[PDB]
Ligand binder design. Structure first.
Ligand SMILES: Nc1ncnc2c1ncn2[C@@H]1O[C@H](CSCC[C@H](N)C(=O)O)[C@@H](O)[C@H]1O
Ligand SMILES: [Cl-]
Length: 249
């Protein structure tokens, strides 16, 4: 059955936002986009639906979120009900690879799942096919906050290689090379990374307590031990993250 690996489910079951941005930043982003009521938002890799739900509440948007996780999709639906916006935003459990909406969106988004389109360029291209005239593309993507000196530092940041990400100005320039204007941006800070990573540790510890005999208990235990050090040594110092608003030239 279509689903993400269990480790992700286990570590992120208590996350509203599956990315290194705070709720305050997500709100800021929504306001920065100057969205009129009834604007349609398509969100590929929509997580637990926080973006769609909170923006439906605060801006009166409508839309669709597609996510491969069975758990996070259920959570998205619950969230929509909790906030009184279940009639405004819909959540589909599915693979977003190659997903093109016939219903074109004023905002077409992929916030932190750019592998869906095979990377930044491919994801932008995919979202462009669902974009209504005059609309905005949202891309959430890491960047090098500082240049990692070695491949060991790149890998400690959970990148395959140093070339996986760009420095901020090089990333912005790459959007221009693809034929897009950068029209807005909200970047994570280290406190946002702290929210995203540190919350996993508590979730893991409680999960271990409640599931001592699970097959994954050993792997979760090992990760809980090493993650705080790895995070603070590598990710927190070297890895940036942001959401970039783009409009085709
Ligand atoms: N092929 C695919 N299609 C749809 N969702 C996918 C996917 N591959 C991974 N995902 C989902 O992409 C998400 C990456 S985390 C980012 C989620 C969301 N934008 C947020 O800010 O919270 C996970 O929820 C995972 O379930
Ligand atoms: Cl629209």
């Amino acid at each position: 059955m279509l689903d993400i690996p269990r480790i992700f489910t286990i570590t992120e079951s208590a996350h509203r936002i599956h990315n290194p941005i705070t709720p305050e930043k997500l709100t800021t982003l929504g306001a920065a986009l100057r969205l009129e009521p009834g604007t349609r938002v398509l969100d590929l890799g929509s997580g637990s639906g926080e973006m769609l739900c909170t923006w439906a509440r605060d801006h009166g948007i409508i839309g669709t979120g597609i996510d491969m996780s069975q758990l996070f999709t259920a959570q998205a639906k619950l969230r929509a009900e909790e906030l009184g916006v279940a009639d405004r935003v819909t959540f589909i459990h599915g693979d977003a690879s190659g997903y093109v909406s016939d219903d074109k969106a004023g905002v077409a988004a992929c916030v932190g799942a750019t592998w869906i389109g095979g990377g930044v360029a491919g994801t932008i291209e995919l979202l462009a096919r669902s974009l209504r005239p005059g609309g905005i593309i949202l891309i959430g993507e890491p960047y090098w906050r500082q240049v990692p000196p070695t491949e060991d530092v790149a890998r400690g940041c959970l990148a395959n290689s140093t070339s996986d990400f760009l420095m901020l100005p090089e990333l912005l320039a790459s959007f221009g090379r693809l034929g897009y204007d950068v029209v807005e941006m909200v970047l994570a800070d280290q406190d946002g990374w702290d929210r995203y990573e540190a919350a996993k540790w508590l979730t893991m510890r409680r999960w271990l307590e409640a599931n001592p005999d699970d097959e994954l208990a050993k792997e979760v235990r090992a990760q809980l031990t090493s993650e705080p050090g790895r995070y603070a040594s590598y990710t927190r110092e070297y890895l940036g993250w942001g959401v970039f608003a783009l409009m085709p030239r």
